[model samples]
Target: MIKVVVRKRPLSELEKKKKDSDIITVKNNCTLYIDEPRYKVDMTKYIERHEFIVDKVFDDTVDNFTVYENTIKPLIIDLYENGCVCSCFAYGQTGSGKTYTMLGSQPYGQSDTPGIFQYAAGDIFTFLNIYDKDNTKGIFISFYEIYCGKLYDLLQKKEVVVKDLKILRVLTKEELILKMIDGVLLRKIGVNSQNDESSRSHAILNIDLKDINKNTSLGKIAFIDLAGSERGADTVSQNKQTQTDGANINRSLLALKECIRAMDSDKNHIPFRDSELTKVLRDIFVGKSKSIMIANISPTISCCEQTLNTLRYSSRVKN
Candidate 1:
């Protein structure tokens, strides 16, 4: 089984003491990352925050490439060598730098270049080079975003609301990136007083590696970018679309947490069907694959309550 690690978002001296016992405290808001568990907080107004756990942390202003190379890259290599399925996901309150950590900045653009896809592709090639010395394998990639309770195949022409079982695949990295760019461009994004260009949907990129050696096949890896959860009241002032989107996001995440809780209790009857997200992740949650969650958190005093809730839920997830 793989271990899940947490990198707390940057916190002030005062906030640091509160979470010091359990979390690996960082120096700034940009350094933290999260994957699983949901958190709720009471701000100037009440707020809810959620993030997943990641394996490592880096300063927010540093290069993302270095972060991947030093932390996530090694993990991928170890998991692939062991023939285990691994998942990397980000979670946190809205505007806590989830996208920045996962995607980075756009390459052809200015200083802000998105690096997740670029780094992931490079790492895959490196993995293949090493593995090819003794064996050959196939790699497949896919990208998708869920919006308004609907699943849009970033690579396909269809925009339909389907069950989570309908995950599509892409054969090449180019195809995958093209689809991801399309989804990002077409998906709804809005600016708020708190975070600029908040994502209105949940996005995921899956990597499936098939190792063919002596007719044996190894498992795969999945990298997920989740939509941040928000309070309905806080979002009502934004727009109808934002409010509806936030509601859908919250409902799906809640469904995921419920499934986790049931699995933690070793219950036979898991509630994967409760939401599209859980249904898709049903196999992984049930032990079909190994997963690592990166929990992203914010340091504001107002976000304290939600952060604790998120941490508690994450603490309960087991192999």
Candidate 2:
């Protein structure tokens, strides 16, 4: 079944100090409760509360590793056994830990918490090791980072390009993790102050499970990380470039929304090419692909608008 999932991060330490709050309670992992706005011009009046339920939810008590094991491990396992395509888009509001969840903590840091990228690679090798413990060997893996952007095309070379970046070969999990530490360093260019250390562009990860003796490809899975779409009203953006960048980011996502909608309908004509962004992803939606959304959401009152936007979009994608 196609599904949309939401993960709600616990309030930051600063949020706890607020003298006031709209959070009535967190009823369950799948449900969120927010006090309803009551009476016109009452100035943030609170009456009853509203509840929203997504396909699946993860509360603060859940750790990063647990999130991967439950939501993503099965997809990876299936990819190793069966050869086909799978896609997951990590969508969320700004500062909701979308990057923190998908990419995880710093590679060189002291934290033991690993991101989905590390977990997926680790498991891919782990499973390979267990299956080929005997005379079987020579099983290896590769990691590549894709850097894509647009410019004025100073060289006048078609005025555009899709950046291609590839990295190393790995065997054991230890070497895999270390090589990734160095590889992750190369994934970044100059950080835009706007999306500083945030998911500024879309990212897709490919995994290949092959039988060394047979010299054949076994299976593959793709994990996509989409940039955060919503900006908190309270945050100030003096930079015209910041607003422009955020708009461009959301514009592509909207294009994706329309394409997914087209697939759900029996329209004789489809317009995936309307946006350069969706055109590349056209095959996955209409072709033989299984898809899901790993949605991230913030629990604070300040993000109510964005919270519902993400949840609703996922619901639309599911249908």
Candidate 3:
């Protein structure tokens, strides 16, 4: 079963307030906060507080990895040992530090700091090194994006129709990096007046582990960075490309939520066939993989509605 974790970005002390009984609250098994939100909610009433980890990152920078290593790495290590599929995904508004936190730029190459993919790959290699004493296991990775109800392989030369969850093996770290670079080139990223370098599509990276000795698989991990949701009315003035992008982003996200709802209810008819993104994730949602949702939030009041909606949708995600 996939375990859910809510990461709340708290509001400043001066902005704090008491929550009214009218606001609906969803219960989660675990809750983590960077700082206390301006409004207070009795999480203890709904969940176990001791399971929470409060981490504060001043800004989206390389230093954040230190906190991630201390807080999240252990969880991943434990999951790997237990042969469970673990996932880490980010959901939040545009320019809310989701990408920066999940995918930092490289340190030495191309003047960009290392992102989540870089760090994750490095970590996987380290894990393999330690666990490879018997040489009984192997790792593989696949990267793709969903744009306007279509699938594009970031690593492949052309867009591959994704009918199901497909895994690709990389013989070396160089190959992985090259594939990622190819993906970046293949992906459609653009800039808007409100934000620069916005992702025009939703991206997912699949990591698979195989244990040769046991003849069993250690579940798969899916690191998903979903595109920020946008309202159609607000995007009317945007150029054709941006508008098309927005439409696709909104549609795919809605489809994703629908799929999650269906799975949570254990509906006999799964809707993965309706969208490329859901199709690729069908197995993870219903299978043995343990999933985690890192709901990234924007602190600005203007985004409250969307943030709340994102959290609400996240709260409905059941193992």
Q: Candidate 2, after superposition: displacement of residue 297 in Å? A: 1.4
lDDT score for residue 82 of model 1: 74
lDDT, residue 47, model 2: 62
Task: Tell me the deviation in Å of residue 14 in model 1.
Answer: 21
lDDT of 1 at 238: 61
lDDT, each prediction: 0.58, 0.60, 0.58
Better of 1 and 2 by lDDT: 2
**How well is each residue in 133-213 modelled by candidate 2, as lDDT tens digits?**
773543343333211223211111122333432323456666655654553443343223234423455544445465667
Candidate 2 error regions (>4 Å): 19-26, 36-44, 106-109, 130-164, 174-199, 210-217, 231-244, 263-271
Q: What digit string (tens of lDDT, one per residue) describes model 3 on residues 29-93?
A: 34432222344373443322212221222322225466366435754685568766676767677
Model 2 lDDT-worst window of ten: 151-160
Ten-residue stretch with the least lDDT total in model 1: 188-197
Q: What is the C-alpha lDDT profile of model 1 across 59-162, one tens digit per residue?
A: 43446676566546755775567776667767667655566666665432233565555576667766766776654676655556666566666544345554
Give the candidates in order of TM-score, highest first.
2, 3, 1
- Model 1 spans with C-alpha error above 4 angstroms: 1-4, 8-71, 106-117, 133-136, 161-198, 211-217, 231-243, 264-267, 301-309, 316-319
RMSD in order of candidates: 8.0, 5.2, 8.3
Q: After superposition, how far is residue 291 of candidate 3 from its true place, in Å?
A: 0.6
Instruction: Give the CA lDDT, 0 to 100, for residue 112 in model 2.
Output: 76
